[PDB]
Design a protein around this ligand. Structure first.
Ligand SMILES: Cc1ccc(OC(=O)N(CC(=O)O)Cc2cccc(OCc3nc(-c4ccc(Cl)cc4)oc3C)c2)cc1
Ligand SMILES: Cc1ccc(OC(=O)N(CC(=O)O)Cc2cccc(OCc3nc(-c4ccc(Cl)cc4)oc3C)c2)cc1
Lengths: 264, 271
């Protein structure tokens, strides 16, 4: 056989994902379903609960509510960018790429990966925040003033469709690997090397989905559509963040994130 | 002499709480407005100075698809009502945060805001005005004084008196900590008609005016006559609002396609 070398590569990527991401789907669903070791998450559903959560659950406070949330979200994405970087290094072959291509892959890959994985902590009612110890409601976010109320809703729309696919962490680990090792990105020096790397990852992904989800043999095609959906979601997100930058006085953007967004 | 006693600590505490309520409840304040107006903000506000720039700004800064085919004068009137309705909501929340206000009879709270909101609106509107124009659309737009004057009657006559007031008001060089107190004093006014317990409001007023006087002396120790100058401004604001109500009534009775927001009609009712 020649399928053992791929089933091996699958486990290895899955192990790198388990090692590198504090939050994952199994952990999130244990919390969301109420099967946690201790207490249910603190629900942030209004201005009073937000203030409570700010003092109690996370380590600025002077600003408008919308800006304070915005800053909190940037703290989370900066954390996830770091985790993704480490995960990428642990993907067999990624470290052998041209140094600049490695940077370009992560620059253009991270937000697609972020929103794919964020789905794991989202349900129709809201999402986990503060290391799984908080839950901010979807309707609270929608009750904020424009343009802040428009930011997360499209992510909820994506997540609900993404979550309908009922992927587990073994599936998501490979999907995220496929997102990062993508030959389509602009400014790539060695596209050939990346295309071949991608070919390997997408092959293990298809095979893994076929073994793990025999009840839907067309899950792989469905995931490829979600991949296209993610690019558009990220394009839109970049636009929205730039509107906040061009119209909002007290809303600052973390310098690492400024750099990621730069020259998209 | 002597260390500060608990009485002045209490007055200082009240001034601080009111100032805090003001920063919390008004997105646009004087410091922020002056940063934009002095060009130290970065995206320059869109300048509205003619019919073409008005059309462009309606496409980018507002989304009223119901006003698209109306006369420019009327479209602007509609946009101004959107802003005023927003400020009336902000003022209500600000008022509920003024210590003592929540303890007033409930009907008196609504009466104070009814007769107090437009004086407060035009006082605060001075913060977003200079001699050439005013910030609109949350600081993202700037409509020129000249353009407003170029509109047909009665529409050209509405904003100009406000610009005239603002120029005089702004020459006082008040900051937000002064203005928050001024607005608190406008709202908590015993001389409004139809109050159920005037005595209660007079006691509240007296307290706020005292804090205002002392804050002004501490914040502007160079200008001891600032407090009486502000009392004069309070009278000028009352007259400005009477004039505005009248001008709006002219539009109401004479204009074919100029409608009034239902909340605004209620405010203007029996003034
Ligand atoms: C209002 C608003 C503004 C911007 C938003 O989006 C972002 O800035 N980013 C970030 C980026 O673009 O890089 C996208 C993003 C990435 C990863 C996670 C994320 O959401 C995490 C989150 N965390 C909180 C939160 C945490 C603690 C408290 Cl006390 C309250 C809320 O709320 C939310 C939605 C958002 C979201 C909401
Ligand atoms: C022509 C005209 C008619 C009536 C006006 O006055 C009012 O309707 N009101 C309201 C009331 O009496 O309740 C007074 C008022 C209160 C608060 C703010 C305010 O002006 C804000 C403003 N906003 C615009 C504007 C915004 C976006 C675009 Cl695209 C174009 C213009 O222009 C202006 C002067 C006016 C002003 C101009």
């Amino acid at each position: 056989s020649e399928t053992a070398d791929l089933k091996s590569l699958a486990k290895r990527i899955y192990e790198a994902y388990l090692k590198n991401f504090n939050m994952n789907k199994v952990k999130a669903r244990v919390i969301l379903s109420g099967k946690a070791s201790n207490n249910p998450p603190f629900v942030i559903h209004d201005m009073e609960t937000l203030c409570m959560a700010e003092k109690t659950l996370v380590a600025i406070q002077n600003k408008e509510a919308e800006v304070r949330i915005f800053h909190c979200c940037q703290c989370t994405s900066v954390e996830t960018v770091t985790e993704l970087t480490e995960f990428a290094k642990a993907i067999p072959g990624f470290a052998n790429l041209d140094l600049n291509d490695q940077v370009t892959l992560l620059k253009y890959g991270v937000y697609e990966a972020i929103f794919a994985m964020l789905s794991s902590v989202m349900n129709k009612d809201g999402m986990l925040v503060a290391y799984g110890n908080g839950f901010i409601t979807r309707e609270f976010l929608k009750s904020l003033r424009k343009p802040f109320c428009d930011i997360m809703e499209p992510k909820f729309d994506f997540a609900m469709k993404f979550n309908a696919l009922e992927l587990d962490d073994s599936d998501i680990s490979l999907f995220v690997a496929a997102i990062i090792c993508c030959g389509d990105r602009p400014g790539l020096l060695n596209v050939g090397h990346i295309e071949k790397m991608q070919e390997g990852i997408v092959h293990v992904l298809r095979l893994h989905l076929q073994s793990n989800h025999p009840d839907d043999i067309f899950l792989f095609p469905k995931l490829l559509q979600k991949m296209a959906d993610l690019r558009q979601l990220v394009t839109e997100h970049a636009q929205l963040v730039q509107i906040i930058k061009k119209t909002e006085s007290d809303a600052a953007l973390h310098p690492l994130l400024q750099e990621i967004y730069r020259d998209m």
